[PDB]
Symmetry: C3
Subunit: 231 residues, 3 copies
């Protein structure tokens, strides 16, 4: 484990995702509202999945070597197995908050799968220049997601209860800022141009992951928007 | 790329799926009917997924070598990753058109997963004679799907609006004819008996894919069956 | 095939899953109740999936070698591909029986995916002591599932029709007893401590699989709880 300088950030990430999972699990014990139960189930699964994948990276299972640039490059593939399941769950939290229609939910989840799937292909591609073709396709899929979150959901939240509109607006802004950083870290990190070393890259993804999952969840599960209007 | 004679058909397929995706995306911009939005989302995702997998084959990522018959045989595995997601989406288009019940939808999607999954196992199997055992199981799963589309959905469409009944009947006939060709191309192509060479096999799958996805989508999204009855 | 002593139990399992699939398929022909159709579709898919994965193990495709303990250990990875899809389908049978809320269904299916996913990682892990870390995480996920089936569903079934309450109680008890045996067989078998040899381990999993899928299905599909109350 300790033979890799980035191990400290993988261990911290593992701990923070595990602690986040347990807090949400305990906090959700005393909840019977069927609407609130939906948000607790979605939001608790997110850091639980991330916990297992951070642990796999810490123990060395989620790491492979990819030859490109005449070098064997360490690629943590477990990140994409994490994101494949956690990013659509996070979008479902937002879509259920605004009572989005089914067709829009399917478009979001499908574009998200394309985003993560093409990012994985780009991470494992051995022809250096082709890695950035996949990065560009994946980034186009992300821009579609961000467009929908702004010019489809925002207008839908305003016609909703005030507390669900204000909570959505906050979580929307958090998501757009944090998610946009991921393609940048990829491009300048060891998967892309190799400007930033792997140990610093790992620290950046850990800050982003914890903020986008545990920070996101703390804002959502403390809001009254997750409960139905009741007397 | 150009070192493979089949590259021209992979490049054409990539272009036609990309163009198809963009047309459906633009055409769906001016749509607010929640029913129509469902069909546009399903139908636009189909060629978008196929685009990415054709590109992976063009660039050489979606290709592996499988030893059988005393030879290293080029097997494009990316086809099955495509079909795993696009064939159930196409069946969902048909099932939603006739307002099929949930139990029937699950049976269709499950049989479809078995069809594609066993076809993938057959494509990667190293014992030559066993490849055709998997082909037979996969073909049995397809025949179940075709039976349901005829002796379960057809009777359901007649009790529906006339425009949804006539549109379903057309898309049903297109699907049964085109899908039935796939097991035949597999059997006589490089995955099976090896009668037809890979470059011709690739041309045939490209014609079938574009017809079953973009041609299918053009018929559906030009129909009024996708809109609810409104004044 | 016959070069492996466990082949006899893989062949028996294949036959019993295939026969089970055909019986459920025939029995479900004469069913039009939309509620009953749901249970028949879920319950017939379970042994059909298991059939294909037992066949892959029989023919040698679903087997790999994992080095640990200074030895190349035969690991049947196809079991986890089976369980990944069949265990959530079995939980869906139970959840639909008691009309569970959506949030609870998602929590069950998500915990089940974590259970199977971490068990697969543990089966393929090359550092011997780490294999049991994954076993423990997977077992914690199972205990969560069992808790929900007892202290969330049981109370919900009592407020239901008497026949659905008594049928659920029976299937609940069958599930908790049979599922609990799996982590024990893993721990003492070739994936874990290696006390029980592989051929005996394979026999035990076959008895458990057939009971948990075909036996489970025979109890459910003979009950009147799967039909709506009708005159
Ligand atoms: C009902 O809706 C509320 C349940 O949602 C919340 C239910 C959760 C979604 C269930 C998923 C958690 C499982 C219990 C998994 C247990 C293993 C975890 C990875 C444990 C990690 C923390 C600890 C080991 C440090
Ligand atoms: C509606 C939305 C959900 C739609 C989703 C969008 C999606 C279509 C976007 C594209 C996804 C696609 C790129 C997934 C590729 C997975 C692949 C990286 C797995 C590893 O295989 C890659 C190479 C080794 O580098 O295999 C070496 C050769 C091996 C012999 C490969 C044989 C196994 C194949 C991988 C079998 C295909 C399985 C499916 C891809 C499983 C789904 C994986 C997940 C990442 C989507
Ligand atoms: C709301 O419902 C309508 C949206 O459906 C339609 C929405 C679509 C389903 C969203 C999926 C498309 C994404 C925007 C993916 C973008 C990358 C594409 C693969 C681009 C391919 C064409 C071009 C690069 C040649
Ligand atoms: C309700 C419906 C959706 C049900 C679906 C029906 C489905 C059950 C039908 C059978 C599907 C099954 C054959 C999928 C097999 C995937 C497999 C080809 C992936 C590549 O692995 C094959 C060998 C190399 O040749 O791995 C070499 C050895 C490696 C060490 C393998 C270890 C990884 C395992 C593959 C882990 C299992 C992952 C799941 C199979 C992922 C789903 C893939 C998709 C193709 C279903
Ligand atoms: C409508 O709801 C009822 C259909 O459910 C029941 C429908 C089933 C869920 C459909 C799935 C079965 C498919 C027909 C697959 C056929 C291949 C099987 C694996 C055959 C195995 C048995 C035989 C080959 C020994
Ligand atoms: C809501 C719920 C459904 C959530 C589900 C819970 C889930 C997150 C729990 C953890 C699942 C995770 C451990 C799955 C790992 C699959 C992995 C074993 C496949 C084989 O790859 C392992 C190594 C060889 O030993 O690959 C060698 C290196 C290769 C180069 C690997 C590159 C391919 C990657 C495997 C791509 C990721 C694909 C996804 C993991 C596909 C889903 C598989 C299924 C088992 C979940
Ligand atoms: C909890 C994890 C989250 C919210 C991860 C989000 C990840 C992304 C938005 C990743 C995007 C990428 C691109 C847009 C292209 C480059 C490759 C990716 C996958 C890093
Ligand atoms: C857009 C792609 C489509 C509609 C693909 C359809 C593919 C099939 C219907 C494939 C069927 C197969 C068999 C029936 C057995 C032989 C292997 C397959 C997977 C080619
Ligand atoms: C039809 C198959 C069924 C119902 C299989 C159930 C399997 C389990 C409940 C497996 C559980 C495991 C653990 C709890 C940890 C050890 C590894 C597993 C996956 C065997
Ligand atoms: C979206 C965030 C990207 C900003 C990356 C900042 C990295 C600064 C760290 C110093 C770079 C290390 C280079 C010298 C080793
Ligand atoms: C009462 C609110 C705080 C509860 C404690 C939460 C502990 C989980 C770890 C959170 C750290 C990361 C927060 C986002 C920066
Ligand atoms: C379902 C369509 C299958 C028909 C295949 C027709 C192939 C004819 C092309 C000529 C065969 C090439 C053999 C000589 C190289
Ligand atoms: C107005 C209808 C035609 C629009 C142009 C569609 C261009 C997408 C490519 C379609 C070619 C394949 C059609 C099926 C044979
Ligand atoms: C949950 C069931 C686990 C019980 C396992 C009993 C196995 C007894 C078979 C004899 C053990 C073989 C050891 C000598 C070869
Ligand atoms: C009339 C009920 C029996 C029908 C025959 C079922 C045959 C399928 C194989 C069942 C054997 C396994 C039963 C569970 C132990
Ligand atoms: C194995 C991959 C299957 C999933 C394909 C994605 C489409 C799923 C459609 C689900 C239809 C709704 C069923 C109720
Ligand atoms: C990782 C594979 C999980 C999918 C298994 C297929 C069954 C899914 C059941 C979904 C139940 C409906 C939830 C609302
Ligand atoms: C185009 C939709 C408007 C909202 C999206 C904001 C774009 C942020 C740019 C992200 C940069 C990634 C490289
Ligand atoms: C048996 C259901 C009737 C409709 C299915 C038509 C069968 C077409 C044969 C396809 C040939 C594939 C080898
Ligand atoms: C803790 C929830 C109560 C019901 C679960 C029964 C636990 C059975 C123990 C299984 C042993 C697996 C190692
Ligand atoms: C080795 C660098 C080659 C540059 C390729 C950049 C491709 C980016 C595509 C974005 C449209
Ligand atoms: C090398 C050819 C061996 C023939 C096997 C055919 C199997 C087909 C099974 C269809 C029932
Ligand atoms: C080689 C045996 C090492 C023992 C590790 C046991 C780990 C079990 C963790 C359960 C909390
Ligand atoms: C609940 C605390 C979980 C912390 C265990 C993971 C941290 C790795 C320490 C080496
Ligand atoms: C929108 C046009 C997309 C065409 C790019 C793919 C074709 C491959 C050319 C080499
Ligand atoms: C319907 C009977 C299915 C039996 C075939 C599988 C058994 C393997 C025999 C070698
Ligand atoms: C993106 C930063 C999240 C901050 C988490 C703190 C929330 C406390 C209510
Ligand atoms: C299967 C052939 C499809 C033909 C596509 C043309 C549709 C234009 C309306
Ligand atoms: C767990 C044992 C199941 C027994 C199956 C027999 C059911 C006949 C109704
Ligand atoms: C009005 C809410 C502002 C939230 C933005 C937070 C950016 C990290
Ligand atoms: C909408 C604000 C985008 C912020 C992008 C930050 C990328 C590091
Ligand atoms: C009555 C519609 C006929 C459609 C069949 C088209 C076959 C390619
Ligand atoms: C229902 C007509 C089937 C046509 C099969 C064509 C196979 C090449
Ligand atoms: C295995 C075939 C079953 C025969 C019919 C059983 C009575 C519905
Ligand atoms: C009251 C029903 C008892 C069922 C338990 C069966 C254990 C195999
Ligand atoms: C609730 C009874 C548990 C039985 C466990 C059996 C494990 C072999």
């Amino acid at each position: 484990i300790t033979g890799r300088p980035e191990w400290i950030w993988l261990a911290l990430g593992t701990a923070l995702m595990g602690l986040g999972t347990l807090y949400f699990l305990v906090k959700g014990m005393g909840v019977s509202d069927p609407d609130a139960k939906k948000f607790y189930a979605i939001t608790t699964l997110v850091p639980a999945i991330a916990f297992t994948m951070y642990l796999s990276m810490l123990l060395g299972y989620g790491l492979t070597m990819v030859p490109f640039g005449g070098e064997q490059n360490p690629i943590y593939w477990a990140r994409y197995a994490d994101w494949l399941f956690t990013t659509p769950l996070l979008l479902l939290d937002l879509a259920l908050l605004v009572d989005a229609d089914q067709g829009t939910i399917l478009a979001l989840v499908g574009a998200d799968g394309i985003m993560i799937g093409t990012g994985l292909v780009g991470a494992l591609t051995k022809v250096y220049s082709y890695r950035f073709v996949w990065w560009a396709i994946s980034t186009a899929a992300m821009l579609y997601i961000l467009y929908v979150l702004f010019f489809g959901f925002t207008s839908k939240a305003e016609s909703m209860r005030p507390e669900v509109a204000s909570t959505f607006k906050v979580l929307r802004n958090v998501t757009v800022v944090l998610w946009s950083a991921y393609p940048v870290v990829w491009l300048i990190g060891s998967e892309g141009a190799g400007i930033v070393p792997l140990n610093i890259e790992t620290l950046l993804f850990m800050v982003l992951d914890v903020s986008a999952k545990v920070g996101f969840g703390l804002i959502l599960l403390r809001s009254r928007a997750i409960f139905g209007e009741a007397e």
